[PDB]
Amino acid sequence: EKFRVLAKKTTIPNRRLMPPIEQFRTYTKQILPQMEQSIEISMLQKQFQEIKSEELKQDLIRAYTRRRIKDLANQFSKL
């Protein structure tokens, strides 16, 4: 129903009867890096396996940080 009459000459209508914008930001900020770090590391641990020296190992990591910190420098440039 839509309308019901209470009494004589009293009609009233009755009353007793996936956001995208978050879907984007949750992908950009949270989901990408967690998917990336699992990739960006496993591509490196394999590369550290064949090597047996401890000099190269600790320099690739420290080079990976520089190349990953620039990613944040761009974000703060934005609003």
Partner 1 sequence: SRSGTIVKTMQKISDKFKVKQTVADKQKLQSFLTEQTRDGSIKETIDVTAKYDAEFKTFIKDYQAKHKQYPHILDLSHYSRENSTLSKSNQLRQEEIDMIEEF
Partner 2 sequence: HPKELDIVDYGSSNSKEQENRKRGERDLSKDNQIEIELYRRIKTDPFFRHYIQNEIKYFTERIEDGVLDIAQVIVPADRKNDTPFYYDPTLEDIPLDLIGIKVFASGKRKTSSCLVVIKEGTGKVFVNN
Q: Please give the residue ranges that form the binding site for partner 1 (CB under 8 A).
A: 37, 41-42, 44-46, 48-49, 61, 64-65, 68-69, 72, 76
Considering the complex, state which of residue 4 and residue 63 has its C-beta at the smaller distance from partner 1. Answer: 63
Residues 6+ apart with CB under 8 A from 12: 3, 4, 5, 6
Q: Which of 37, 41, 36, 46 is nearest to 61 (CA)?
A: 41
Considering the complex, state which of residue 11 and residue 75 has its C-beta at the smaller distance from partner 2. Answer: 11
10 binds, among partner 2, partner 1, none (CB under 5 to 8 A by kind): partner 2
Q: Does 6 bind partner 2 (CB under 8 A)?
A: yes
Long-range contact set of residues 20-26: C-beta below 8 Å, sequence gap at least 24: none
